[PDB]
Amino acid sequence: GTILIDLSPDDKEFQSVEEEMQSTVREHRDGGHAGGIFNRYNILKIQKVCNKKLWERYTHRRKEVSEENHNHANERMLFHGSPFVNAIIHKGFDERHAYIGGMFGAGIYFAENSSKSNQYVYGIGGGTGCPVHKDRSCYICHRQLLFCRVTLGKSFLQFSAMAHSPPGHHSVTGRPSVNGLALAEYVIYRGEQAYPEYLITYQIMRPE
Ligand SMILES: Cc1cccc2c(=O)[nH]c(-c3ccc(CN4CCCC4)cc3)cc12
Ligand SMILES: [Zn+2]
């Protein structure tokens, strides 16, 4: 049921998505070990992901959460990186997309920083890097990230120096608590709480 519609670079939707990708790059504490060394991306393509069934699954859950939270879904647009992005766009998120060893328990993780999600495109800690060159900092191979609509509802705030949500909450927020420049990370424990809205194909760029 999934179709991918290419956005034109002249389209304001393309432009606002590219800006969120570019403007949320930061330096990482591993100096680029996991995701590579770069300050920006070369964006090759942005596709809209269209799946009626998966959309209806998202909006149904969004309505449940909202009615549990004074009519407030607390919906965000967040990045997700994974070796399985091509399964996600066809089948949606579910328990097999969870990060079992994540710092906030076995759930599905999303980032405000695009460069954080970039660290997981080739697997946990960047795995062994690109499949062609075995290079975590490959500047040639094409990478893909998702930019997703995510329902957080009432989020449990964890100050930070599938399982269940903490009782009375619909998600967990990982608040950066040492690195003053890092943006938040978020965890959901139900795959129906995210819809993978854009597929972004890119390369990381070598600093000049
Ligand atoms: C911890 C964290 C913070 C912020 C963003 C992300 C993210 O985008 N992906 C991931 C991530 C981690 C692992 C996996 C895939 N594992 C591979 C076997 C199934 C789960 C997929 C995505 C983690 C993450
Ligand atoms: Zn490569």
UniProtKB/Swiss-Prot annotation:
Instruction: Specify the domain of life of the species encoding this protein.
Output: Eukaryota
Residues annotated as binding Zn(2+): C130, H133, C138, C141
Concerning PTM, the database record says:
Ubiquitinated at 'Lys-48' and 'Lys-63' by RNF146 when auto-poly-ADP-ribosylated; this leads to degradation. Deubiquitinated by USP25; leading to stabilization.
Q: Where is the PARP catalytic domain?
A: 8-208
State its location(s): Cytoplasm; Golgi apparatus membrane; Nucleus; Chromosome, Telomere
* Membrane-crossing residue ranges in chain numbering: none
Q: In which tissues is it expressed?
A: Highly expressed in placenta, skeletal muscle, liver, brain, kidney, heart, thymus, spinal cord, lung, peripheral blood leukocytes, pancreas, lymph nodes, spleen, prostate, testis, ovary, small intestine, colon, mammary gland, breast and breast carcinoma, and in common-type meningioma. Highly expressed in fetal liver, heart and brain.
Q: How does it assemble?
A: Oligomerizes and associates with TNKS. Interacts with the cytoplasmic domain of LNPEP/Otase in SLC2A4/GLUT4-vesicles. Binds to the N-terminus of Grb14 and TRF1 with its ankyrin repeat region. Interacts with HIF1AN. Interacts with RNF146; this interaction leads to ubiquitination and proteasomal degradation. Interacts with NUMA1.
State the function annotated in the UniProt record: Poly-ADP-ribosyltransferase involved in various processes such as Wnt signaling pathway, telomere length and vesicle trafficking. Acts as an activator of the Wnt signaling pathway by mediating poly-ADP-ribosylation of AXIN1 and AXIN2, 2 key components of the beta-catenin destruction complex: poly-ADP-ribosylated target proteins are recognized by RNF146, which mediates their ubiquitination and subsequent degradation. Also mediates poly-ADP-ribosylation of BLZF1 and CASC3, followed by recruitment of RNF146 and subsequent ubiquitination.
Please give the family membership noted in the entry.
Belongs to the ARTD/PARP family.
UniProt name for this protein: Poly [ADP-ribose] polymerase tankyrase-2
> Which gene is transcribed and translated to give this protein?
TNKS2
